[PDB]
Amino acid sequence: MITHISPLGSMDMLSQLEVDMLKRTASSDLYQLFRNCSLAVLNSGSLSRFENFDINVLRRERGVKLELINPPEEAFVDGRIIRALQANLFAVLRDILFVYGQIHNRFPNLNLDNSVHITNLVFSILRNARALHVGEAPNMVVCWGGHSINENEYLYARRVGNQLGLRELNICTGCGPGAMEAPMKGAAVGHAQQRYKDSRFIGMTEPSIIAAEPPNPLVNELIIMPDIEKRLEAFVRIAHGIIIFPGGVGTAEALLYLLGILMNPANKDQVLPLILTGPKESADYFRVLDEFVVHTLGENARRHYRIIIDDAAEVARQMKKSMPLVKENRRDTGDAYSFNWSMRIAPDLQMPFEPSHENMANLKLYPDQPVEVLAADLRRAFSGIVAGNVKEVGIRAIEEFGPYKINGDKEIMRRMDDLLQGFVAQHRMKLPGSAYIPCYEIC
Amino acid sequence: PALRMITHISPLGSMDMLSQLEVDMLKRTASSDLYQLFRNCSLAVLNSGSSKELLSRFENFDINVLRRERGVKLELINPPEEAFVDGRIIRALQANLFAVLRDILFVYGQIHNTVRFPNLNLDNSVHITNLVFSILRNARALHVGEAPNMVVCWGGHSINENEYLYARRVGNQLGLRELNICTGCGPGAMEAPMKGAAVGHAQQRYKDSRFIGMTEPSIIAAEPPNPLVNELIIMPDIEKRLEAFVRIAHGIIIFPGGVGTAEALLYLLGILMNPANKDQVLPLILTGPKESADYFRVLDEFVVHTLGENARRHYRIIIDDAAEVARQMKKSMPLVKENRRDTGDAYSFNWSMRIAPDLQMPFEPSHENMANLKLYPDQPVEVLAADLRRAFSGIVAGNVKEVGIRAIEEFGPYKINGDKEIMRRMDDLLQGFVAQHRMKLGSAYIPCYEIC
Amino acid sequence: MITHISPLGSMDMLSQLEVDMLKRTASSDLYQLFRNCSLAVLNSGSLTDNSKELLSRFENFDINVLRRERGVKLELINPPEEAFVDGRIIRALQANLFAVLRDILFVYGQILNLDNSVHITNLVFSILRNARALHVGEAPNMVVCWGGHSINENEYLYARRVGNQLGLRELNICTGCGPGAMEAPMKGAAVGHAQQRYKDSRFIGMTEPSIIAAEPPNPLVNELIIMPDIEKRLEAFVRIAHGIIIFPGGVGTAEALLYLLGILMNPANKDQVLPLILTGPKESADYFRVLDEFVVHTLGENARRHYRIIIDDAAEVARQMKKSMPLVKENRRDTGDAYSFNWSMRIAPDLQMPFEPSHENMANLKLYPDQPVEVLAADLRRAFSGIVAGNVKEVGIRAIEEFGPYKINGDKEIMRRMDDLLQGFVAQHRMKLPGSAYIPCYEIC
Amino acid sequence: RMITHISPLGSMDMLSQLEVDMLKRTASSDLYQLFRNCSLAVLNSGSKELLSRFENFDINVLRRERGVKLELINPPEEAFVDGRIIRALQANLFAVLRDILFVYGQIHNTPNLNLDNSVHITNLVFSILRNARALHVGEAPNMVVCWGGHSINENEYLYARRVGNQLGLRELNICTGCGPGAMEAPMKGAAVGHAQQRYKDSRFIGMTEPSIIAAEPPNPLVNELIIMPDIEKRLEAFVRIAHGIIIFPGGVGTAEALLYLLGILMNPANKDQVLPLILTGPKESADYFRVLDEFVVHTLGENARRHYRIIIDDAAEVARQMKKSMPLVKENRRDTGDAYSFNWSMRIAPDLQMPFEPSHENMANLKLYPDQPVEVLAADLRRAFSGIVAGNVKEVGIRAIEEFGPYKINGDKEIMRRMDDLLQGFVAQHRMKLPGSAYIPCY
């Protein structure tokens, strides 16, 4: 049961030599990753049911075509593939076969350890994805949120979305469900009411995530950054403003990434508004969160972030006001509106981190350390926990090597565990499906 | 002199180019008795997205027309604040406001200000049909050469969530096939198809969704527009608003509705049975979720009784398969194109559709008029449904429209008479409509109608 | 040999009754005008300028209006073969063709009291709005240009360069839809639009049914408007223009320059902002000297406040206009006026009232210096239209056949100074395109 | 103002910082003289005498965080309107930046680019064309490449304006060598045509090369300037982008192109290709074409009159033909799975892709003999015309033919004899040099 999809959105003008490299990489051991990311995309609107599915790349003189063998029928309306899903499909080929292949094959001097190279790559990737619009006045609000979230948390984030869209702002989330879908959903409705024509709804994700988490159907720009170290850096550089909702260990982990970069002294003059918000009930959640930050980083971290409870209008209003300040801030520095080139991200924050049980129990989670190293290695630990929850390698590794164990001191490790268990009690650790098994053991 | 909230809105969408003498027309008509109407229509528009209860909270509101040499501007005094963002009027409400200005003070204003010699009135079905065209062209709803995608959806204002989601789902399939929606500019079944169609449009990167809302002054004064509408049109008569529905449409889908939705159907079915329209293609398809099976079965029995079992060659009833409902309309789009190509008719306005003058003639819901409705099978099915349409439109007057909402206790509640089995098959439907809350949204409902 | 033209640009959406109306209007005696205006449109340039002579070759032509349910179409019977590319009517001509259906059969046919100066003006707005010429929310860029239907190649070159400069400053041009001066600026402005990547060129040709039937549209025009009177065509020219560049011309260009100056010198329009520049190519020195020498003491001495003369600086001329734009935009905000239409300009009913030459009417011309500056220019405009009527306008040509040259009355050295102007027009070969000699329909003194 | 800072327009709009760096290194390298001279030329669209009239001119690359700007020291006063660079000049300027410093720099200093493989040289030409956003995707064929002399009389210049008009009347675009005479009048005529048919979005490409551009500024009609590295690859891009060629009356070069074409057309694997070649002239041209036809038939084969067609003084027919052929290409493309914008399928033989160093030793080893296969013939026939063209404008070749000896070539005498009659006629046609100063042969 075979369908020949032509390119939409991406990979339209391919050279004949590139077409050959795409076909090679698609026969390589990368196949399954390119398969699954491609089956996920075809299944936005929620893997093991579609074991018949297989996607073959097809060489034509002009460019490439994708062949869909036993694809999921709901991605087709009267025969034709839904345009959005078709384009996400080709975005996966772009950022899986094209991107992730090319960075290993070859490229003369791609250090991949020079934090310069690393940032220029994240620029390149966004550029190839046609996501850095030239002469674009700043409108993008990177939203961060938890994937399992309450109907009230959802209804609240939809309202924040709607107010953002009523102020002609665009959204960039994790390409996923719950809080990454609901701001897009709400913004769309505002855009409409204000006759906004061209909505951008970027979804920023990574290969391991997108294999088990389809995009939400709202995304119209799908970027698969290779590692969360890049995905996170990409979040920061493209955004002109961040709103961190109630999330789990992922959303938590992103916060430390921000705060690691924002506290740096080099970025004392950079302009990137951070606003943690939530509904009236989230107030307790933020309490703990905030105290946890104060204690790990200082009262000096509260200067970079602001908490608004149960005022979505103001939350949007604040960002719509900030946008003229992100514009001027980039104008003075001679920076790009698209890409926050000037922001100083620390090699300790860009360096890929492999979440091995060893690495997690040698984390420098001690107060005798600079705040940078603390939040950096904090984040490192928050990524392993995201590992044992969703990423395939982690969910298996915890059930075969045993939970992650963590070092540190108490009050530090003490308070965090109060976060972690608190997260579970809110069920933001795992989808409502079944229950949750801690992949972590904190003293 | 007291504390007031002032804003000035510049024309968006309509009334952008205005000669100076026209500007004088509008200002005069806005001092005319038409003010109160104009005011409450513009109030209803502002209150899109939030029943007279809302309108008795904005009694401080007043809308004043401003002259400038170039054209016009609209002054909002104590406007509802929920219609502004950071002090700026939401663009959509801004255009709908200037739609109201067009269709109430320009359109309906020039009409209200014409002679009505009842000795020699222009009952000409050509006027009513060229007029209906002229109204749509002024509201820029008639796009040259745009191929047929408009699907006119009908349904009750008060419907149950199961219906609402179904109309929503039907909407989704409709838009997933790059099809536009036209409705009654209202809540319930009149917004839920747009809501779902919207999502389909997105998934397919369908730019320029047209969600036209055909209403009428009475309805819109009391019922603000539903938020999904982008082209708002305020046709003067339910008689002309109906006819507009029919001509612009390239497909019709009737959901489960109360009196209004019923009355439109008879109006439609009447134009479909007319012989000159045996070669005209316009797909009519009633749909609803599973629970509406019964409703429609009754519905059918009423129609076949009033029209014959030959009615059923003009519609098709689909239950719980919104995908197919859209699939079919989508399939029928090419037919309507060629049907218009052959005859040389226009995509936008069905000029060849013969609509009968007794279907185009307005029916004042006088209680005397109402019982004089010849509801007898000896008459052509044409005249049977014409009067049957007219009866169904009276009940809606008693329920929503001002004249007859209160004109009913004064001059008395409505009473219809004719063939008894006809009146009987009506009561099951009407009294069924009461049990489905398709008459009124409910907390309270008065019959406003009486049959032996 | 028949071909079927569907509507392009205008008369796209039409109600069945309207189509019905156009059908009858086409069967009326207007047919000749409607077919005559249609024939010029279909000839435009095509490397032939013969006034009426070229058109005599197409005596078999005929255009019938067709009625379809959707709208209207146009039937071309024996149409000039040069208006077709491999069978397809060239789109510009097709649009200009359909503009004649709009403005001859729809507009002109249907002609509200037309002596009320208010109704007149709002009629002129309604004609322009119909041709979608008053665009909404457009910063001012329109420089109306006036000139001569006949001009040596010297002036043509200059006005291309003026037009090139003008275009190079993202300025659109508007003329009288004719040749020579009414084409050159567009020809260059277009070039200039290219270099500065200005995509939406707007080259408006505004004309009357009297002129279009004998002077076809130059092919540069992409917005054609056929206003009914020269009186209404002029009124339009003024309202839509945000600047005006007068080149050298004959008696027609002359007719405008008094029209305009009359309106500007009126007191109510002292605060209005409309930059008037006269430019010529160096050799125009004397022509502009004798023109200025004429105006100074025929009309007011103070009238040199309302025009600036520039010779052989095409750059500066366009620069000045490109600076004037923001002032005109400010002048409209302050008045709360529109950019597209200058409503506030007080145009006198004496400048709105059509003029029929005859001969008594030329005798009853109050050309006296005692007369107000205004009254003087109103009838001074009229005098020139006489010479423009019997020059080319068929009604006037026949009228100078029977009763001969118009007897221009007036008085004062005013008459002698008209004569040495008029003598120059003919002596400079700006009164008739080269082909025969010229027969003065004017008898001064 | 004597200094002005021009922003990127049309190219080089989105640049990564590592890129912005490499550009300045290349501006600091000896390439500057080329980049200066091409940028002077671009700015003088409105003869190498004007090069010595602007000696103080100098153009510098400004680095910014966002991207690059261009610093213009003492530019020709004619390029600015009220101080603002003419939008079109500005974009030509940045195409010089794109194609001299980015393209020309990067390929010479690399090496995984073999540049000796005909698969490489071909995909490079695709690449540069894509990079200059000139290969439009999903564009129905309309691109009519027009070849012809730079020194052509007023009858030919006017005729090509007519064949240009007629092409525009029929909504066809034009591509030439960014030059005067025949390379301008078509575009001049074509654009009137596009006006008359309300054709918006005209395309007027100009393929040229660094040695050419620096002494011959682009004509003012060109809106896409493309500067391919050499004449060998310039021609390849000519061919491959074009859906139809018209060869006007030209000299050497217009000579050199035709043998290039014919070499590729007569080659067997290209007998199924669809690319009309109409050689047209204005009636007095009959004699020049006569001599031309007699020449090829002998020098190649009477089997060559299959690939070209001669029309004289029928501009409307020349256009009429090409418009009919525009659909025929589409099928020829759609069948093979080829791209409408690039003619991937055509087999250009490597002998025609390999740059020919116009040296005297090399000019001797030109197999100019009728025993060789018509393919081999052509290739070396072309190489010979690259030699003479060098003698005329190319710096390398004007220097080599100065005191170091005019270019000398021989072979079969009938062949040689045909040549001297042609070349002699070119001199007599003043197609070899523009001005009336008598021309001195390099042959």
Ligand SMILES: Nc1nc2c(ncn2[C@@H]2O[C@H](COP(=O)(O)OP(=O)(O)OP(=O)(O)O)[C@@H](OP(=O)(O)OP(=O)(O)O)[C@H]2O)c(=O)[nH]1
């Ligand atoms: N600074 C900045 N400019 C950008 C960016 N993306 C596009 N641009 C535009 O590039 C233009 C460059 O103008 P400048 O800021 O004065 O130049 P700079 O780069 O800062 O250094 P320079 O002084 O030349 O040496 C701006 O036009 P204007 O500001 O003059 O007018 P407007 O925004 O209204 O359109 C911007 O609109 C960006 O990320 N940062």
Ligand SMILES: Nc1nc2c(ncn2[C@@H]2O[C@H](COP(=O)(O)OP(=O)(O)OP(=O)(O)O)[C@@H](OP(=O)(O)OP(=O)(O)O)[C@H]2O)c(=O)[nH]1
């Ligand atoms: N008659 C009519 N035509 C419409 C309508 N909407 C779009 N069109 C188009 O306008 C074009 C005019 O077609 P005609 O040549 O005039 O049809 P004819 O029957 O031959 O003569 P007639 O209309 O009676 O005067 C149509 O065909 P095309 O040129 O596009 O090609 P195509 O027709 O192949 O689809 C349609 O595409 C409409 O409501 N009515």
Ligand SMILES: Nc1nc2c(ncn2[C@@H]2O[C@H](COP(=O)(O)OP(=O)(O)OP(=O)(O)O)[C@@H](OP(=O)(O)OP(=O)(O)O)[C@H]2O)c(=O)[nH]1
């Ligand atoms: N004068 C004029 N204005 C128009 C026209 N069409 C829209 N407008 C808008 O009207 C604005 C005038 O400014 P306002 O202070 O708000 O006055 P208005 O309410 O519009 O009328 P009012 O003058 O008070 O009677 C301009 O915005 P700006 O703030 O940018 O002012 P600008 O472009 O002039 O620099 C225009 O954008 C028009 O045809 N003429």
Ligand SMILES: Nc1nc2c(ncn2[C@@H]2O[C@H](COP(=O)(O)OP(=O)(O)OP(=O)(O)O)[C@@H](OP(=O)(O)OP(=O)(O)O)[C@H]2O)c(=O)[nH]1
């Ligand atoms: N060959 C070609 N196709 C292009 C190009 N750009 C887009 N396309 C489109 O890609 C479609 C390919 O359809 P396919 O089913 O795959 O059939 P083929 O063309 O034979 O290629 P295939 O062998 O399957 O790989 C074409 O549809 P149609 O063939 O029906 O043509 P159109 O719609 O434009 O009128 C084109 O519309 C291009 O540069 N070249």
Ligand SMILES: O=P(O)(O)OC[C@H]1O[C@H](O)[C@H](O)[C@@H]1O
């Ligand atoms: O917070 P979780 O939902 O538990 O983990 C994934 C998140 O990590 C990132 O910040 C994205 O916003 C994701 O939403």
Ligand SMILES: O=P(O)(O)OC[C@H]1O[C@H](O)[C@H](O)[C@@H]1O
């Ligand atoms: O309650 P109902 O009157 O039945 O619902 C309102 C509908 O009746 C009218 O015809 C309009 O089409 C509306 O869609």
Ligand SMILES: O=P(O)(O)OC[C@H]1O[C@H](O)[C@H](O)[C@@H]1O
């Ligand atoms: O009659 P001419 O003076 O020779 O030229 C025609 C002029 O008369 C009209 O007003 C046009 O705008 C032209 O300026």
Ligand SMILES: O=P(O)(O)OC[C@H]1O[C@H](O)[C@H](O)[C@@H]1O
């Ligand atoms: O001026 P000529 O030297 O005679 O001709 C040179 C041609 O060869 C090149 O392809 C260019 O496009 C030119 O058209």
